[PDB]
Design an enzyme around this catalytic site. Structure first.
Site, PDB file in Angstrom:
ATOM      1  N   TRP A   1      42.378  51.186  35.174  1.00  0.00           N
ATOM      2  CA  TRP A   1      43.718  49.330  34.855  1.00  0.00           C
ATOM      3  C   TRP A   1      44.971  50.100  34.728  1.00  0.00           C
ATOM      4  O   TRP A   1      45.598  50.813  33.695  1.00  0.00           O
ATOM      5  CB  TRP A   1      43.657  49.149  34.231  1.00  0.00           C
ATOM      6  CG  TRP A   1      41.887  47.619  34.618  1.00  0.00           C
ATOM      7  CD1 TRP A   1      41.935  47.224  35.324  1.00  0.00           C
ATOM      8  CD2 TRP A   1      40.684  48.571  34.287  1.00  0.00           C
ATOM      9  NE1 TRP A   1      40.096  46.612  35.985  1.00  0.00           N
ATOM     10  CE2 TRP A   1      39.700  47.578  34.547  1.00  0.00           C
ATOM     11  CE3 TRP A   1      40.158  49.669  33.512  1.00  0.00           C
ATOM     12  CZ2 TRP A   1      38.512  47.582  34.815  1.00  0.00           C
ATOM     13  CZ3 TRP A   1      38.504  49.247  33.364  1.00  0.00           C
ATOM     14  CH2 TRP A   1      38.140  48.683  33.859  1.00  0.00           C
TER      15      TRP A   1
ATOM     16  N   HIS B   1      42.634  41.869  33.723  1.00  0.00           N
ATOM     17  CA  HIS B   1      40.756  41.332  34.894  1.00  0.00           C
ATOM     18  C   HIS B   1      40.787  40.116  33.739  1.00  0.00           C
ATOM     19  O   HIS B   1      41.640  40.167  32.815  1.00  0.00           O
ATOM     20  CB  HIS B   1      39.998  42.612  34.483  1.00  0.00           C
ATOM     21  CG  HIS B   1      40.271  42.592  32.880  1.00  0.00           C
ATOM     22  ND1 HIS B   1      39.195  44.209  32.441  1.00  0.00           N
ATOM     23  CD2 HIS B   1      40.621  42.871  31.953  1.00  0.00           C
ATOM     24  CE1 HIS B   1      38.869  44.520  31.930  1.00  0.00           C
ATOM     25  NE2 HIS B   1      39.899  43.707  31.192  1.00  0.00           N
TER      26      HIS B   1
ATOM     27  N   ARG C   1      48.141  43.824  38.074  1.00  0.00           N
ATOM     28  CA  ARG C   1      47.624  44.977  37.726  1.00  0.00           C
ATOM     29  C   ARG C   1      49.391  46.252  38.912  1.00  0.00           C
ATOM     30  O   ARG C   1      49.384  45.204  39.453  1.00  0.00           O
ATOM     31  CB  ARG C   1      46.969  45.332  39.100  1.00  0.00           C
ATOM     32  CG  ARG C   1      45.590  46.260  38.064  1.00  0.00           C
ATOM     33  CD  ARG C   1      44.527  46.320  38.789  1.00  0.00           C
ATOM     34  NE  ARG C   1      43.380  45.544  38.412  1.00  0.00           N
ATOM     35  CZ  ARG C   1      42.340  45.698  38.745  1.00  0.00           C
ATOM     36  NH1 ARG C   1      41.917  45.984  39.608  1.00  0.00           N
ATOM     37  NH2 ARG C   1      41.581  44.812  38.222  1.00  0.00           N
TER      38      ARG C   1
ATOM     39  N   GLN D   1      40.512  36.608  40.750  1.00  0.00           N
ATOM     40  CA  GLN D   1      39.406  37.130  39.698  1.00  0.00           C
ATOM     41  C   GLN D   1      38.693  35.825  39.139  1.00  0.00           C
ATOM     42  O   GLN D   1      39.315  34.991  39.068  1.00  0.00           O
ATOM     43  CB  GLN D   1      39.185  38.301  39.023  1.00  0.00           C
ATOM     44  CG  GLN D   1      39.405  39.756  39.507  1.00  0.00           C
ATOM     45  CD  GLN D   1      39.590  40.941  38.543  1.00  0.00           C
ATOM     46  OE1 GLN D   1      39.000  41.059  37.270  1.00  0.00           O
ATOM     47  NE2 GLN D   1      39.519  42.091  38.679  1.00  0.00           N
TER      48      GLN D   1
ATOM     49  N   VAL E   1      29.570  47.285  30.092  1.00  0.00           N
ATOM     50  CA  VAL E   1      28.526  46.943  30.271  1.00  0.00           C
ATOM     51  C   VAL E   1      27.700  48.045  30.727  1.00  0.00           C
ATOM     52  O   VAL E   1      28.274  49.139  31.926  1.00  0.00           O
ATOM     53  CB  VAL E   1      28.914  46.354  31.926  1.00  0.00           C
ATOM     54  CG1 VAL E   1      29.031  44.719  31.475  1.00  0.00           C
ATOM     55  CG2 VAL E   1      29.559  46.711  32.546  1.00  0.00           C
TER      56      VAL E   1
ATOM     57  N   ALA F   1      27.213  39.628  32.811  1.00  0.00           N
ATOM     58  CA  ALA F   1      28.442  39.618  32.888  1.00  0.00           C
ATOM     59  C   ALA F   1      28.600  40.299  34.941  1.00  0.00           C
ATOM     60  O   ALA F   1      28.078  41.126  34.488  1.00  0.00           O
ATOM     61  CB  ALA F   1      29.849  39.889  32.237  1.00  0.00           C
TER      62      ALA F   1
HETATM   63  N1  LIG Z   1      45.339  45.535  43.645  1.00  0.00           N
HETATM   64  C1  LIG Z   1      43.864  44.147  43.814  1.00  0.00           C
HETATM   65  N2  LIG Z   1      44.209  43.219  44.979  1.00  0.00           N
HETATM   66  C2  LIG Z   1      42.926  42.894  45.141  1.00  0.00           C
HETATM   67  N3  LIG Z   1      41.768  42.663  44.703  1.00  0.00           N
HETATM   68  C3  LIG Z   1      41.500  42.799  44.027  1.00  0.00           C
HETATM   69  C4  LIG Z   1      42.851  44.621  43.322  1.00  0.00           C
HETATM   70  N4  LIG Z   1      42.124  45.365  42.344  1.00  0.00           N
HETATM   71  C5  LIG Z   1      41.055  44.660  42.575  1.00  0.00           C
HETATM   72  N5  LIG Z   1      40.275  43.828  42.958  1.00  0.00           N
HETATM   73  C6  LIG Z   1      39.130  42.571  43.043  1.00  0.00           C
HETATM   74  O1  LIG Z   1      39.272  42.164  41.965  1.00  0.00           O
HETATM   75  C7  LIG Z   1      37.773  42.458  41.616  1.00  0.00           C
HETATM   76  C8  LIG Z   1      37.549  43.384  40.287  1.00  0.00           C
HETATM   77  O2  LIG Z   1      38.315  44.267  40.051  1.00  0.00           O
HETATM   78  P1  LIG Z   1      37.674  45.302  39.425  1.00  0.00           P
HETATM   79  O3  LIG Z   1      39.066  46.073  38.862  1.00  0.00           O
HETATM   80  O4  LIG Z   1      36.980  46.167  40.611  1.00  0.00           O
HETATM   81  O5  LIG Z   1      36.659  45.588  37.965  1.00  0.00           O
HETATM   82  C9  LIG Z   1      36.770  44.517  36.941  1.00  0.00           C
HETATM   83  C10 LIG Z   1      35.827  43.711  35.944  1.00  0.00           C
HETATM   84  N6  LIG Z   1      36.560  42.646  35.825  1.00  0.00           N
HETATM   85  C11 LIG Z   1      34.828  43.321  37.213  1.00  0.00           C
HETATM   86  C12 LIG Z   1      33.919  43.433  36.387  1.00  0.00           C
HETATM   87  C13 LIG Z   1      32.861  42.027  35.273  1.00  0.00           C
HETATM   88  C14 LIG Z   1      32.372  42.486  34.654  1.00  0.00           C
HETATM   89  C15 LIG Z   1      31.066  43.351  34.769  1.00  0.00           C
HETATM   90  C16 LIG Z   1      31.101  44.641  34.944  1.00  0.00           C
HETATM   91  C17 LIG Z   1      32.968  44.019  36.020  1.00  0.00           C
HETATM   92  C18 LIG Z   1      37.444  43.972  42.642  1.00  0.00           C
HETATM   93  O6  LIG Z   1      35.649  43.622  42.324  1.00  0.00           O
HETATM   94  C19 LIG Z   1      38.273  43.632  43.698  1.00  0.00           C
HETATM   95  O7  LIG Z   1      37.504  42.217  44.286  1.00  0.00           O
END
Ligand SMILES: Nc1ncnc2c1ncn2[C@@H]1O[C@H](COP(=O)(O)OC[C@@H](N)Cc2ccccc2)[C@@H](O)[C@H]1O
Ligand SMILES: Nc1ncnc2c1ncn2[C@@H]1O[C@H](COP(=O)(O)OC[C@@H](N)Cc2ccccc2)[C@@H](O)[C@H]1O
Ligand SMILES: [Mg+2]
Lengths: 265, 775, 233
Positions: free
Chosen positions: C32, C61, C87, C101, C144, C197
């Site tokens: 991140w 996130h 980000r 998100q 997780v 989650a």
């Molecule tokens: N720069 C960006 N612009 C737009 N959408 C983005 C992005 N980076 C990621 N995303 C979207 O946001 C979602 C979450 O980001 P990511 O860093 O992949 O996951 C992060 C965690 N918050 C998800 C998670 C929660 C709980 C347990 C396990 C995983 C991704 O699946 C992707 O579809």
């Protein structure tokens, strides 16, 4: 400039309390996975009475004072868009929809049915001739009464509580054995409120459903599944909730009254 | 991470195909970003060996005499070109990836070149191009088409997650395919070592930086080009073959995730010392770059007498000087486990990211060193015919992993599956775990290359992926939520009903970045942003919005410039940042207004924006009003603070013209409030049937007096039976005091239980007129 | 039966990284690209209205809310958390710096992965289907174990869509929660309960659903674009 002055008279809309209460009741059940569907106000004696274990010449047919209709060229549609026959009337309760739905669908499922119903009694402040009810039906293998009890409990909590609780007393209805009438604990006002009736769907109703289904060419779907249904008075509840005193107030198109619920949400 | 199918197939023979492989890996937790075919070699390119290399007088070229089957000459400019090596000969007529022009016989400089020998870039097997490919002079019978020994290959671009550092080694993955049931072939490191003592010593001065460190000794080295299969494998993996010895360190680094470096003894002196760098120490690194060290940098040095000199950068890169070359006959083999953070620090400290740095930063098997040495050494004996000493110089004894408690029942409970105990253990054991105990809770000790395996859950994730995530059934939970979770949604919902009402009232919703240009704090007369970015995306998005409207207005402009909307009404809800994070709501109106399109008149401006506002609260059941207030960003006179039911929150008014103009913009009308809005729980109230008492009334008060206090007074004195109070008209007025105004007030009265007796009406009326201007 | 709740956009390094098993100097903190903040007199509120400390930043996130919620409440429960996240990457047509998100968390005794699988499946059905299905592949996340990335079957367009990540809440996260709870005087509530989650990209999905091509389009306050969704419902 004088800013404290009134702006351009623009119309501010509002919503009817029944719609409001309907919506709230619905949002509630929606959260338990129930889906909202509607039926017709003009029904056939078949769906209103026959389908549900209600007899012609016996004491049961005599609990609901019905409004019979007449007129020709009126087309009544069945669950599948077919024409059905029977003496026409105004749905006495929402229960008929239990049947139209079960005929048209396959279990397991959860539905809730809001609807304007009609009865021939004299209009006082707690009773009317045109009121709404909300029906609920959950059918599936394994369904038991404890589920109906749970369901209702989640409803009370959601309405008052968690310092609120549920009251189930046995009562009789042709379409559900075990039958029951239920009351909710209103911690605020401090009294028990008789809300509606419910029970475990009667075997004869499931029978009726499949029988009509095969008549329509569909395979039987309710053999070996169980289910509970319930139905409650919406005005009776809206009144208690939004603090209204006269049930007659709802159909009295007075604005001064209607506007009082403008910002209910 | 590049994964050469055939290479990995060496450890997992029964592999179906690159496609089944991509499949198998995805399931194990590795996503393939790309797949590629790679070594297309025409029949035109064949193996040849340089018999003689004669330079051409007066030029920087050589005429090479090649044994290609029949003898033949080519002319090369490449420096590495010389007698005694095998080369890739592209015969005349060959079609090469690079040159769209076919290879031919050209007279170069008094000599006719029969074709051309190739650089990796030219053959298409690599990026290099600064010199010929170099092969063991005897790799193949002169003439044999190269393709014969160099088939095309398939390379998967994989993604190795930070939790699977053991996966940076092909053998690491092979251990997984094995878990799935595949047969695993571990290279056998055959070695014939001698009893002799090691001609140098090892001193680890900074053990915190180099927790585990080993040295190997190989002599009698015949350094030469690496055999074809290795050059093939390395090129395939994205690395470039140098010589058998160097190539071996890279091959093994890729096989196990264990980087290693071979140092020419000529430069070691008395021994190797692993220590931090001395301030301003110099080192000409492998890449040909001369660098200056920082004292935090762990380095691999040597020493002669009282001389300590740096040989290479610990874990990151080797020095240019000590690096192995043709004339090397004995070396010392670095195989260690460095401290990730130091490497990370040191690595990013200079502009570097190398195969080695990467793996050391991610993690290395704390005990892989010695077996790693046996492998590399055995390889050395084989390809460089090295004489190897049987002893090693070792430093730091690392401790083994501990047993992890494991309950098969818990695993099933957590996944919601029902795998038989036996199946589970079988899996862990295939993964290299030791499973002791009789049940139900077991003692499971993971292999050391597995750093991601510490808790019982890490163990469960395992049975899962090996059995296959798809084998976990589908279910739905049912439970009565703990009580304190009951009302939770209220706020969120509140905001949404609001958001919704607006769009319904007629406002177009808009989303604006939460950033702010510090400069606008000026452009728009408002205090400065309390929060700034340490890494702004742009100096114009270096602060955090303190207000929402600046952004709306700014949106207004750019819209005008792109499409020319006659009018615009919109809103936005967002988080602004002052002392605390706050949810604000602002709306902007602009344009001709509403009315008949064709018909002349419009009705717009401030009082239009207010109109809507009033309606909105009317709909929300909240009593709102405005009172003139001075606002730095708001044109005065047309400025006003907002009073939601009984309270001050936000403002409303016309955009101060000064700003109106500092921006190519005409007039705009705004308002910005703070959420959540307060709420008045309805108290229903029976309306009475007895007709109301109607009245005609006007008030004459100074031209400056605000409508406010006026309505207020009249209202507060009206009495308790005043049902309605409205204003139907007013004008300054010729027929009255130059400095006073008139006010058309319609009045209504009602009594619930009975009708209002006129006695009380014209009576209370006075109650008002009295204190009306009695004031 | 999930309930929607929101968190703050400006978070503490503690809730964004520390609480969730994310290390300072290790490869995890490096997935991140964060936006660090500065400024004084800014008051950051904790789950209980207490002041908390940590280097300020913009929530990377929505996960932090997993913690603020668990600290303030008692299981069993189901929540979903929409939220604008931030980000530092370069803005292209499928990637942005400011996006939203939706986080989901279900904690209770007996919770298993099959429930997380069911949950997600009901989501696909609800979005496309019932001729649609769900894809769960193992992936790694510090908070997780088991971790997983998931894709949905779009019967229409005929392709798999990588939607988000999910997994079974990590023991260390439950630990963190109770530890902070006792620090605040509350009794431990997450000993012996389980949970899953997940979190997904909203723009990534809105785009596929409402047929938008450029993710950059969302924050581009152009009316001609905005109005195109007037009657979406
Ligand atoms: N720069 C960006 N612009 C737009 N959408 C983005 C992005 N980076 C990621 N995303 C979207 O946001 C979602 C979450 O980001 P990511 O860093 O992949 O996951 C992060 C965690 N918050 C998800 C998670 C929660 C709980 C347990 C396990 C995983 C991704 O699946 C992707 O579809
Ligand atoms: N005249 C009237 N005016 C207003 N509300 C009335 C009413 N008569 C009945 N109600 C309300 O409407 C509700 C339903 O009417 P009731 O005839 O009691 O039940 C009739 C069934 N529809 C309920 C049921 C469904 C499924 C299984 C068991 C029972 C009552 O609980 C009552 O609160
Ligand atoms: Mg694991």
């Amino acid at each position: 400039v004088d800013v404290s002055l009134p702006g351009a008279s623009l119309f501010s809309g509002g919503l009817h309390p029944i719609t409001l209460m309907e919506r709230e009741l619905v949002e509630i059940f929606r959260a338990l996975g129930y889906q909202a569907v509607e039926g017709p106000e003009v029904e056939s004696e078949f769906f209103n009475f026959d389908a549900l274990n209600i007899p012609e010449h016996h004491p049961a047919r005599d609990m609901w004072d019905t409004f019979w209709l007449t007129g020709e060229g009126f087309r009544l549609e069945g669950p599948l868009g077919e024409e059905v026959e029977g003496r026409l009337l105004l749905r006495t309760h929402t229960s008929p929809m239990q049947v139209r739905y079960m005929v048209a669908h396959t279990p397991p499922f959860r539905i809730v049915v809001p609807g304007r119903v009609f009865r021939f009694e004299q209009t006082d402040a707690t009773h009317e001739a045109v009121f709404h009810q909300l029906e609920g039906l959950v059918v599936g293998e394994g369904i038991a009464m404890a589920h109906l009890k749970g369901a209702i409990y989640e409803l009370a909590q959601a309405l008052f509580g968690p310092d609120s609780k549920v009251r189930f007393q046995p009562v009789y209805f042709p379409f559900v054995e075990p039958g029951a009438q239920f009351a909710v604990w209103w911690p605020e006002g401090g009294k028990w409120l008789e809300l509606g009736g419910a029970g475990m769907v009667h075997p004869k109703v499931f029978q009726a459903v499949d029988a009509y289904r095969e008549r329509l060419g569909l395979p039987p779907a309710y053999r070996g599944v169980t289910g509970f249904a319930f139905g409650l008075g919406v005005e009776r509840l809206a009144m208690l909730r939004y603090g209204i005193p006269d049930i007659r107030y709802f159909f009295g198109g007075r604005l001064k009254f209607l506007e009082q619920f403008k910002g209910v949400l | 991470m590049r994964v050469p199918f055939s290479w990995l197939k060496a450890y997992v023979p029964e592999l179906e195909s690159p496609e089944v492989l991509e499949e198998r890996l995805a399931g194990l937790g590795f996503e393939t970003d790309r797949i590629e075919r790679v070594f297309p070699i025409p029949r035109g390119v064949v193996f040849a060996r340089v018999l003689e290399a004669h330079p051409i007088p007066g030029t920087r070229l050589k005429r090479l005499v090649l044994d290609a089957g029949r003898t033949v000459e080519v002319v090369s400019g490449a420096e590495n070109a010389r007698k005694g090596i095998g080369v890739a000969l592209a015969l005349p007529g060959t079609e090469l990836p690079g040159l769209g022009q076919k290879v031919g016989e050209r007279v170069i400089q008094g000599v006719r070149s029969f074709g051309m020998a190739l650089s990796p870039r030219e053959l298409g097997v690599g990026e290099y191009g600064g010199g010929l490919l170099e092969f063991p002079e005897d790799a193949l019978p002169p003439g044999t088409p190269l393709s014969e020994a160099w088939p095309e290959e398939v390379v998967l671009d994989l993604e190795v997650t930070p939790n699977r550092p053991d996966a940076l080694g092909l053998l690491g993955l092979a251990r997984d395919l094995h878990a799935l049931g595949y047969a695993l072939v571990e290279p056998e490191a055959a070695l014939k070592a001698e009893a002799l003592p090691l001609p140098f010593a090892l001193k680890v001065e900074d053990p915190e930086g180099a927790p585990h460190f080993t040295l190997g000794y190989a002599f009698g080295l015949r350094v030469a080009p690496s055999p074809l299969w290795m050059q093939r494998a390395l090129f395939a993996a994205g690395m470039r073959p140098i010589n058998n010895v160097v190539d071996v360190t890279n091959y093994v680094m890729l096989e196990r995730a264990q980087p290693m470096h071979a140092f020419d003894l000529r430069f070691v002196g008395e021994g190797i010392a692993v220590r931090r760098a001395r301030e301003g120490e110099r080192l000409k690194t492998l890449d040909g770059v001369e660098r200056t060290l920082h004292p935090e940098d762990l380095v691999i040095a040597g020493w002669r007498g009282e001389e300590s000199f740096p040989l290479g950068l610990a874990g990151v890169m080797g020095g240019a000087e000590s690096e192995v070359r043709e004339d090397t006959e004995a070396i010392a083999l670095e195989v260690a486990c460095f401290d990730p953070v130091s490497i990370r620090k040191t690595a990013r400290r200079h502009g570097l990211r190398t195969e080695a740095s990467h793996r050391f930063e991610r993690g290395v098997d704390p005990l892989g060193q010695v077996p790693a040495q046996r492998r590399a050494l055995s390889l050395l004996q084989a390809l460089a015919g090295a004489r190897v000493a049987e002893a090693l110089l070792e430093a730091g004894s690392p401790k083994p992993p501990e047993a992890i408690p494991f309950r098969p029942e818990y695993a099933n409970r957590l996944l919601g599956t029902s795998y038989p105990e036996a199946e589970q253990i079988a899996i862990l054991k295939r993964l290299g775990c030791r499973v002791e105990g009789e049940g139900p809770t077991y003692r499971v000790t993971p292999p050391s290359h597995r750093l991601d395996l510490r808790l019982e859950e890490d163990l469960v994730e395992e049975v899962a992926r090996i059995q296959g995530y798809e084998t976990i059934p589908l279910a739905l939970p049912a439970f009565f939520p703990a009580p304190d979770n009951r009302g939770v949604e209220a706020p969120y919902r509140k905001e949404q009903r609001l958001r919704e009402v607006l769009s319904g009232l007629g406002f177009q919703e808009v989303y604006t970045y939460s950033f702010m240009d510090p400069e606008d704090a000026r452009r728009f007369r408002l205090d400065p942003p309390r929060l700034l970015l340490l890494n702004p995306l742009a100096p114009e998005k270096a602060a955090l919005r303190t207000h929402l409207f600046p952004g709306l207005v700014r949106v207004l402009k750019e819209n005008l410039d792109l499409d020319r909307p006659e009018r615009a009404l919109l809103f936005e809800v967002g988080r602004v940042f002052r002392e605390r994070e706050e949810t604000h709501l602002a709306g902007l109106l602009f344009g001709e207004g509403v009315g008949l399109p064709w018909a002349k008149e419009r009705l717009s401006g401030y009082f239009l924006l207010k109109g809507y506002l009033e309606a909105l609260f009317a709909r929300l059941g909240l009593a709102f009003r405005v009172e003139a207030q001075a606002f730095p960003f708001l044109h005065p006179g047309v400025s006003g603070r907002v009073l939601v039911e009984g309270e001050e929150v936000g403002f409303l008014g016309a955009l101060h013209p000064e700003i109106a103009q500092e921006l190519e913009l005409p007039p705009v009308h705004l308002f910005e409030l703070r959420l959540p809005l307060p709420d008045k729980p309805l108290a229903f109230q029976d309306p009475s049937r007895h007709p109301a008492a109607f009245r005609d009334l006007a008030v004459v008060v100074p031209a400056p007096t605000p409508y406010g206090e006026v309505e207020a007074l009249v209202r507060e004195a009206a009495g308790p039976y005043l049902e309605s109070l409205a204003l139907f008209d007013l004008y300054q007025g010729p027929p009255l005091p130059e400095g006073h105004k008139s006010l058309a007030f319609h009045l209504r009265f009602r009594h619930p239980k009975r009708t209002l007796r006129d006695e009380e009406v014209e009576e209370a009326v006075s109650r008002v007129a009295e204190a009306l201007r009695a004031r």
